[PDB]
């Protein structure tokens, strides 16, 4: 990131590392570009000639996919301190072995509750285009040519209503898969477990629960202006919201 | 500069694409790498008179694949298509068109997988140990290792034979077992459309950058396909007229295999979403679904 | 009773949780603390569902851009073509920017039916992991969370659900010498719910996912014939629980 | 043909019908197609040693 800092590799894919100030032509090129294809700190990999990274023979994971089991990512204690960019071959997993022979079995003492995540996207956002606003944008004669241009604006129309009806389908197939709204017993006592954060919250005034609550602050999800956008719009502001 | 008029749709495409391939790696992660630890096999191949020799790694191959591996490798003539080298070889001596050469000249190129065969070699061998020396505990945890015999017994009573039909006649289920293998060997060495649905792939592949190559030579109701011929043989009045009926026919046919990747691309995610299913419930477990990994009882 | 039936579900015997029900509520209740943790310390877990707000903000915005391109006419504004050129004349060049911006129009539109295909699938395996993980118990293995299941709980989100699995996972390993059955009296006996463990000198029978030795008798062993079949069989004696009986 | 046994379904292994192996319900009236064999006790024999 350039939050982070500004150098920076440079991937030329399938050529030769000696061929390289012969692929772009150099000579013509600025002196900034010529530092990038110098001969200094360059590597062959299989998808072409790397420069500006330093091959370092230990293994990570995987950072920034270059190709062909090449990976990159930027180092802090590279060399003596001098944070750079550097290029490895990508580590698969610890080795591992398992001794096998013919009696001899391994069978747990103990055990552990592991409560894991799942994030699963359902619907997206349902879209709407006005096609003679569009195309035109309040022109009568604009209008007038475009009507003998058929029936493509009905089309459209017809599968972006499709694609909006199907939205509301996948959400009524997601979550409501029970007929009747129960609830809990006011007592929350179920034999020690304690789901007080994921049952709702009534001090809210959206009755959901904690980790809901955090889900929801999580994803920056855009108003998309389809409560009751167009009184902002009319007013004029410095801030013209997208 | 006339190119610069249209503007955004060469990054959406290019968009598309990047999509596309980083969706490729996404793919194969999901399907291989699913094992923690790269586990080895004993050096001690008596897994209860079963013979695993024919599908665990030959260390006499230079990249550590199988015996059957190198078949399924054999059969599917896929070729150069980018994915090493090919650029000095353009420009070397070989003084002929190649297929793949005038691609690259044109702006087509293929970039190579992130996981080379070798890696995903060792990702099959470690789920094959896995398999071998610890049944299904190595998908549910750490590996616990147990004689094959026993897990063989496991698999029985699974799908409700009891155990002792397996120790009164082991021998003769290792003997099927290893002329099954050998039948498939017999099957792979002779049948080389056993393997279509890949060369399905790679030939779907070739054949739309064949297309995209070949619509070049298109005119598109102008009057030359050349386009510096335009620029010579006619001024700026109306030769901007006249390439603009190019233009616009090269970026529909751009967007035109844009397209048909975008939803082949659907297509493989849907079959590798599948096959990353298969992984996980009949490799690392049993399953007790009908007809999802082989006819009878798995 | 609940908690019990979902050992019994994955080969635990129920007992197992009666004698552990403190420190299994325990660990529940530290798992659930390390996901409000992990969720409160880290945004970019959630990245799949602000995919979905992406697509569509970076779609529309192009879909705006496209407004600035000429299409080969003489200008991107609509009235000066009017206004600067004769009726003929700018039909000619008012046809290349109507074609130009529903050509667009469509790739939008086409872009949006495969991005749509692709979120129904996604909704489709959401359907599939309620109805098989919240409203029950699954056997299918990794389909939801690594281990074996016990049971999974659901949770609103923008444009999306996100389910938290509950799952057993073994932990403390031990070697064990092992044998596939015991022959006594000439008669060889096949564990009927467990395996035949020992410990140097003392053989036992235990459950597989969890360490309980007991005493090998006859109510949990079956007899299937002599031992000459049998491959690895050993030589142990099985206790009659009714032999005391006899005595009186 | 001649004698009742008891198998498993997936694999013929016939094995004599005790009290062991069979679980009672109820009386002989309801049940459609019930037919008349002697259901072996083990523990009769051992007790009368
Ligand atoms: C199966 O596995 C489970 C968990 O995986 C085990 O359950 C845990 O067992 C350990 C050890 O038996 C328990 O640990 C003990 O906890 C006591 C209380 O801990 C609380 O208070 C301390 C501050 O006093 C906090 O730091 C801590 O976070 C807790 O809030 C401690 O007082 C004990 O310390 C004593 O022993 C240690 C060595 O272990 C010494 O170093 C100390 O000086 C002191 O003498 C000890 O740490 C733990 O409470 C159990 N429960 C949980 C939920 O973790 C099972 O024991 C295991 N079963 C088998 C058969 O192995
Ligand atoms: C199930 O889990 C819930 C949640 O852990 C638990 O309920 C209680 O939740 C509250 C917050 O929801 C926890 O926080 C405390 O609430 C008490 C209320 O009296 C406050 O007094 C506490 O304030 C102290 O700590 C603050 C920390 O900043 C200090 O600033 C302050 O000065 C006080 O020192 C604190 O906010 C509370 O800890 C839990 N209760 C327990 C016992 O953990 C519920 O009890 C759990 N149920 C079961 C059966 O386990
Ligand atoms: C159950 O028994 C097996 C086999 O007896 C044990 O596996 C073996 O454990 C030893 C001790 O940890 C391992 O030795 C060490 O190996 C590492 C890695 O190679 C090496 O760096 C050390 O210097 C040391 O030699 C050994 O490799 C391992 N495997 C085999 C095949 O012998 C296992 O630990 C036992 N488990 C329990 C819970 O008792
Ligand atoms: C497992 O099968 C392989 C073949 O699939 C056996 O290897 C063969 O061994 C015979 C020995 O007479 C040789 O003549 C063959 O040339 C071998 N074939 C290959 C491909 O190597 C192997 O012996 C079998 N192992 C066991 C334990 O039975
Ligand atoms: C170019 O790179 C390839 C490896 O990709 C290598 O085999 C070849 O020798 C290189 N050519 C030169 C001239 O260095
Ligand atoms: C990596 O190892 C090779 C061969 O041992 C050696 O030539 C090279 O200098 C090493 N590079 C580094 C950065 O250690
Ligand atoms: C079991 O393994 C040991 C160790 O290699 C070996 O000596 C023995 O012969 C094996 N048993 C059988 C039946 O092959
Ligand atoms: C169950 O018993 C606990 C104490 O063991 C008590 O606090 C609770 O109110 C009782 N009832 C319910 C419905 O949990
Ligand atoms: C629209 O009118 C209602 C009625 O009072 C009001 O509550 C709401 O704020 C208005 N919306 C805007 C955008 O002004
Ligand atoms: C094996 O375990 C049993 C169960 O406690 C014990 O009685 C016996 O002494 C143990 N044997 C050895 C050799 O430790
Ligand atoms: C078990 O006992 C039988 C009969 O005395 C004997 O033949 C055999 O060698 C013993 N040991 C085994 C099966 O390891
Ligand atoms: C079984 O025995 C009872 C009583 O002797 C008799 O009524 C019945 O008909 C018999 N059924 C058959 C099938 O023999």
Not at chain 2, 202 to 228: D, R
Not at chain 3, 107 to 124: H, P
Not at chain 3, 139 to 158: E, I, N, W
Request: aromatic share 8%; with cysteine.
């Amino acid at each position: 990131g350039t939050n982070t800092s500004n150098q920076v590799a440079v991937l030329y894919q399938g050529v030769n590392c000696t061929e390289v100030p012969v692929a772009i032509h150099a000579d013509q090129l600025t002196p900034t570009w010529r530092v990038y294809s110098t001969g200094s700190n360059v590597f062959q990999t299989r998808a072409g000639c790397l420069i500006g990274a330093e091959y370092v023979n230990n293994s990570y994971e995987c950072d920034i996919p270059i190709g062909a089991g090449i990976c990159a990512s930027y180092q802090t204690q590279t060399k003596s301190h001098s944070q750079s960019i550097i290029a490895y071959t990508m580590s698969l997993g610890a080795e591992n072995s398992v001794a096998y022979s013919n009696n001899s079995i391994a069978i747990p003492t103990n055990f552990t509750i592991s409560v894991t995540t799942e994030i699963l996207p359902v619907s997206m956002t349902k879209t709407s285009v006005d096609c003679t606003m569009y195309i035109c944008g309040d022109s009568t004669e604009c209008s007038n040519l475009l009507l003998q241009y058929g029936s493509f604006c009905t089309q459209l129309k017809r599968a972006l209503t499709g694609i909006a009806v199907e939205q509301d389908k996948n959400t009524q197939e997601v979550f409501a898969q029970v007929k009747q709204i129960y609830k809990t017993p006011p007592i929350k006592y179920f034999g020690g477990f304690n789901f007080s954060q994921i049952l709702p919250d009534p001090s809210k005034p959206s009755k959901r629960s904690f980790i809901e609550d955090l889900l929801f602050n999580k994803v920056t999800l855009a108003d998309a202006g389809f409560i009751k956008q167009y009184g902002d719009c009319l007013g004029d502001i410095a801030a013209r919201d997208l | 500069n006339l190119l610069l008029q249209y503007g955004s749709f060469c990054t959406q495409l290019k968009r598309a694409l990047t999509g596309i391939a980083v969706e490729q790696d996404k793919n194969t992660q999901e399907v291989f790498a699913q094992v923690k630890q790269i586990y080895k096999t004993p050096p001690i191949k008596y897994f209860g008179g079963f013979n695993f020799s024919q599908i665990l790694p030959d260390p006499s191959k230079p990249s550590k694949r199988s015996f059957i591996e190198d078949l399924l490798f054999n059969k599917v003539t896929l070729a150069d298509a980018g994915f090493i080298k090919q650029y000095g070889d353009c420009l070397g001596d070989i003084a002929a068109r190649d297929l793949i050469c005038a691609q690259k000249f044109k702006g087509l190129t293929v970039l190579p997988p992130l996981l080379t065969d070798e890696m995903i070699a060792q990702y099959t061998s470690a789920l094959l140990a896995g398999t071998i020396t610890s049944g299904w505990t190595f998908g549910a945890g750490a590996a616990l290792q147990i004689p094959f015999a026993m897990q063989m017994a496991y698999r029985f009573n699974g799908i409700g034979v009891t155990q002792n039909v397996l120790y009164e006649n082991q021998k003769l289920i290792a003997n099927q077992f290893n002329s099954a293998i050998g039948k498939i060997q017999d099957s792979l060495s002779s049948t080389a459309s056993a393997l279509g649905k890949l060369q399905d792939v790679v030939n779907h592949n070739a054949q739309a950058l064949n297309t995209l190559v070949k619509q070049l030579s298109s005119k598109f109701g102008a009057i030359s396909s050349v386009l510096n011929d335009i620029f010579s043989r006619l001024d700026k009045v109306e030769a901007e007229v006249q390439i603009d009926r190019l233009i616009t026919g090269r970026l529909q046919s751009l967007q035109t295999y844009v397209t048909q990747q975008l939803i082949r691309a659907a297509e493989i995610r849907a079959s590798a979403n599948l096959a990353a299913t298969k992984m996980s419930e009949c490799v690392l477990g049993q399953s007790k679904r009908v007809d999802f990994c082989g006819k009878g009882y798995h | 009773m609940q908690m019990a039936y979902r050992f019994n579900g994955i080969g635990v015997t129920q007992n197992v949780l009666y004698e552990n029900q403190k420190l299994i509520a325990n660990q529940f209740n530290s798992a659930i603390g390390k996901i409000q943790d992990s969720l409160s310390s880290t945004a970019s877990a959630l990245g799949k569902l602000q995919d979905v707000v992406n697509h569509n903000a970076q779609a529309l915005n192009t879909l705006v851009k496209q407004l600035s391109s000429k299409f080969g006419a003489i200008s991107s504004v609509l009235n000066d073509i009017f206004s600067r050129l004769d009726k003929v004349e700018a039909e000619v060049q008012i046809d290349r920017l109507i074609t130009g911006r529903l050509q667009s129009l469509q790739t939008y539109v086409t872009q949006q039916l495969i991005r749509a295909a692709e979120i129904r699938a996604s909704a489709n395996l959401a359907a599939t992991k309620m109805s098989e993980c919240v409203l029950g118990q699954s056997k299918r293995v990794d389909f939801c969370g690594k281990g074996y299941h016990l049971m999974s709980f659901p949770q609103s989100a923008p444009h999306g659900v996100v389910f938290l699995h509950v799952t057993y996972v073994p932990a403390q390993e031990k070697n064990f010498t092992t044998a596939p059955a015991i022959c006594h009296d000439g008669k060889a006996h096949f564990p009927r719910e467990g395996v035949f463990v020992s410990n140097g000198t003392h053989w036992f029978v235990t459950q597989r996912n969890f360490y309980e030795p007991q005493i090998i008798t006859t109510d949990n062993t079956f007899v299937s014939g002599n031992c000459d079949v049998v491959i690895g069989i050993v030589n142990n004696t099985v206790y009659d629980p009714l032999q005391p009986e006899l005595d009186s």
